[PDB]
C-alpha cells in the first residue's frame, strides 16, 4: 500500500 499521511500518523 502507498498513501500520504499526517506527520502525526508518521511515528
Amino acid at each position, epitope marked *: 500500500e*502507498q498513501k500520504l*499521511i499526517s506527520e*502525526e500518523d508518521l511515528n
Partner: antibody
Amino acid sequence: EVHLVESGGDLVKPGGSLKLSCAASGFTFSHYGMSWVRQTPDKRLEWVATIGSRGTYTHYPDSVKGRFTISRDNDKNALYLQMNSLKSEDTAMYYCARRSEFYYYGNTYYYSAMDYWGQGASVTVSS
Amino acid sequence: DIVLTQSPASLAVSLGQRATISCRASESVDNYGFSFMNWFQQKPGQPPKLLIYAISNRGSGVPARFSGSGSGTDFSLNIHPVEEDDPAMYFCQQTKEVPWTFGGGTKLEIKR
C-alpha cells in the same frame, strides 16, 4: 472540506517587512506540517518555508534564509510567514500548503507532499 | 541543489490523444525503493494542484488518465486520453532533499 485561506498580501518598499497569515480549517491542523511556496511572474514555483506539526522544526532555502520565519498557532488553526528586508525579487504570489508524509509498504517516511493550497497572496516589493 | 529539467516546454495535443511530458533530474531522486518525484497541475489563475506523488500515485480526485513513470533521474507524466479540462501548466517537483525544487513547467494546449 479542507480549506486554507491566505491574507496579508500587499505592496512593500524595499527593505520593508510583511507578515502573511494562512487560515486553516477542515482537518486537525496540529497533525500536519505546513509550508509556504511563492510563484514569480515567470511562473516558476519556489518552495520557501516549512514548519513541523508541533511547530518545533522549521527550515528554509538559502533564498530567504535569515529574512523569513515561519510560525504557527495551532489553537487558532493558523500558519504565518514573517518577511523582513524585502527585496523586489521577493515579489510574487505566496501560497501556503499542507504537507503529508508517506506510508510506503508498512513503514513511514517524511515526504513533504503539498496536497492542498490556499488561493494565494500577491506580494510586490517596489518603491 | 538538484535542478530538474522539463521537456518539452509547451505541447499541443488533440482531444483524445496522448500527452507525454518529461522531467529529468540532476542527481538521483531514488531512495528506500521509491523516488521523491511529484507532479502538479496549475491551471491559470489557480494554485498548483497535486497530481502525483512518489512517481506514480494519483492525488485525491485525480482520474486514472494521469499516470507517472520512471526511476532514478528520469520521469514523465502521461495523460491518455487528453480531455478539454487539461490545458494547463504542469510542474514536476522533487523532495528528496532541500531545497525541494520544481521543474520549469510544461504548458499543455489542446490542438484544434
